[PDB]
Design a binder for this molecule. Sequence first.
Ligand SMILES: [Ca+2]
Ligand SMILES: [Ca+2]
Length: 364
Amino acid sequence: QSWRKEANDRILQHRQRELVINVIDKEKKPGIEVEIKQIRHEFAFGSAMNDQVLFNQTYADFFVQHFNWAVFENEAKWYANEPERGKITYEKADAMLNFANRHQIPVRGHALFWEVEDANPNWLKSLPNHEVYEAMKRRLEHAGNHFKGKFRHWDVNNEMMHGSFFKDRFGKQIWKWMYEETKKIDPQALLFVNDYNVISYGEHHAYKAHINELRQLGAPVEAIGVQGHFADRVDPVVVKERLDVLAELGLPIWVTEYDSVHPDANRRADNLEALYRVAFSHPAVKGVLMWGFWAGAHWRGEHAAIVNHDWSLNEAGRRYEKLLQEWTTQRVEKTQVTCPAFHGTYEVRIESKMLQQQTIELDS
Ligand SMILES: [Ca+2]
Ligand SMILES: [Ca+2]
């Protein structure tokens, strides 16, 4: 279809950068073979990670082979780090961070706050306003400092468009406080809004206005997360359209929690390809994460998974693997170096000299 051909053109346009450098065998100047193999993608192809990574080595091996970015499914939410008032625990999250660090997988932080009441610790919901804020104060300072420099990103206040637990008690100025004070504690962290029904539904204009209001209020929102929880069908054209609207704020966009549900793995694969190809082709998008992969541990069950219960791929996992292969630069050339190559890091051989080629510049 037309949407795929335009997507592929923008992929070549925005995801690659022509290569050429060094090449001297002690001052030689015109032949030899040159091997150009990509070893890391700059673009994020990540996944939610859950408790299975602590006891399921098959799950752990599968993760490392398929995802270059992670986010924790539950183990950094407030109720999980403070299940009872004043009883603070980060052990599970720290263990998952060590696993990710030893495999050099960057981790998104999810999430310091969540505006939806039903997602907050139950002990918080009977407290008077000023005690709620005191608990908020300690959460932000205790978790913000504990995770300082561990997360590349924070979902600072999840789903502000679809809750009102904190806004009702303190007004939208509490949101400026959330972003401002996280920025001060952890300047290196890229601070996100993250919300649903924006590309899977038509709330993108509301979201755009919502990002605007947060920034005019002074909140240092640096990036836009769109969750990408779809139902049964992914229309690539409308997704591209809704992304177009959000791109006008000049902020990087990440698809943070992709999944769709369909009994027929074939359509599941088509949905996945539709979102990933369109997302990978949008110049404002910088990464995609899948909210789980394995039928044994997916929050929407086996009809959303790319790998079956017994760890055999289904068609959606196969399609995911082929998309990764399609989007990997592996070239042998004789030629004095010329090829387009996806952003990332490269081993160039004459496996000898590892070299980076990022996206800061657009000219070779
Ligand atoms: Ca946990
Ligand atoms: Ca969405």
